[model samples]
Target: QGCAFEGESCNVEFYPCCPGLGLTCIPGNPDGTCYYL
Candidate 1:
């Protein structure tokens, strides 16, 4: 499975462990707009 939305997602285990797409850390805005790296 994957993030329900686009760009990137929060960690599956916990939140704010950092934004990411799977295991890759990504960039995001305060409003939850994430850019997958």
Candidate 2:
């Protein structure tokens, strides 16, 4: 489990091939953080 810094939002299309790789967005600093479960 990890978080990626996304300026505005996490684009799901970033990992289009692996749909089961549970991913979500968490509000942070200014924009937000993308967490992979």
Candidate 3:
């Protein structure tokens, strides 16, 4: 699958790779949210 862009939601199934130059994931309940660092 592809990656989650900035502000996009994410999960533990590796669904969102956060395909940035070098970003991060702001963890959330029931899952998480993708972010840019």
In order of TM-score, best first, we have 3, 2, 1
Taken over the whole model, the C-alpha lDDT of each candidate is: 0.38, 0.41, 0.61
Question: Where does candidate 3 clash, by residue pair?
Answer: none
How would you encode candidate 2's per-residue C-alpha lDDT over 1-37 as one tens digit per residue?
A: 3334432354343422123555455453333445565
Per-residue alpha-carbon lDDT of model 3 for 1-37, expressed as tens digits?
Answer: 7476767776646575366455455673445777666
List TM-score per model, in order. Answer: 0.19, 0.28, 0.54
Give model 1's clash tally.
Answer: 0
Candidate 1 regions with alpha-carbon error over 4 angstroms = 1-5, 16-37
Candidate 2, which segments miss by more than 4 Å at Cα?
A: 1-8, 11-18, 28-31
What are the C-alpha RMSDs, in order, of all predicted structures? Answer: 6.3, 7.7, 2.4
Query: Residue 28's C-alpha lDDT in candidate 3?
Result: 36
Lowest lDDT sum, 10 consecutive residues, model 3, at 22-31
lDDT string, candidate 1, 1-37, tens digits:
3342444454443343232543332432233433433
Higher-ranked by lDDT: 1 or 3:
3
Q: What is the lDDT of residue 32 in candidate 3?
A: 70
